Design a protein around this ligand. Sequence first.
Ligand SMILES: Nc1ncnc2c1ncn2[C@@H]1O[C@H](CSCC[C@H](N)C(=O)O)[C@@H](O)[C@H]1O
Length: 260
Amino acid sequence: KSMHARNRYKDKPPDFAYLASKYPDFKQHVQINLNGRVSLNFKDPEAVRALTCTLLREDFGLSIDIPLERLIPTVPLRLNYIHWVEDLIGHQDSDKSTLRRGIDIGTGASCIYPLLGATLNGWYFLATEVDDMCFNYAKKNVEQNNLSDLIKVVKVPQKTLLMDALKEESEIIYDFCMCNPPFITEIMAEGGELEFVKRIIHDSLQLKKRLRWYSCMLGKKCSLAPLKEELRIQGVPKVTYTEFCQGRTMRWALAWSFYD
Ligand SMILES: Nc1ncnc2c1ncn2[C@@H]1O[C@H](CSCC[C@H](N)C(=O)O)[C@@H](O)[C@H]1O
């Protein structure tokens, strides 16, 4: 399955030529290809950073500052997750009177899911990070876009996930959590992604209805089936999944709930 139908980049892909004409810091990172078209080297982190900062500024009015030494997100791909969560929670069929409350697990230096969700929909976020650099940058990025009344960035300890974040300080009910990557013997090892999502499932079995939906965007096709099986085993009553992509960058979205 392709881009989300409501993704703005579905039928308006980024125009490199337009962006080069308007943004001189972006222009210094593009070149002309064989076809005579403005292009970008997607293996150069400086160029990828410029594209991402430029798109956020152009299409969302967001100014962000991010390091070369931490993950640089790809904006069109992230929007698919935002629109999917919108579908999960019934966002299209409600109005502004309903405030929504999300958790972004491992928000990254860009704090991108909360910035997009707060900007587009006025959603609140608790945004967690274990990494010091990512935490600091995420926090500057929220503050420089004046979104700290909607987005609370928190450094959490290394070993913790959802439960340790949600105590007497917490909101009673959250609408969703979000999470994406990175995360002789016959038996294959679980690997990083499968282990990590299983920690989310484990916390969800304690929290139950304190969140309306648990979700995670998977980077590996092979994660999906064993995650579904673990959910079946545990009696989780409502499971849904789908797929999204931006060119070759593929994702498998999985969400579950303890509500009927
Ligand atoms: N248990 C945990 N709690 C919070 N953040 C975590 C975590 N384990 C890993 N992370 C963070 O998860 C991130 C990688 S996965 C999420 C990527 C993020 N949405 C982005 O766009 O950058 C890293 O920033 C890492 O520091």
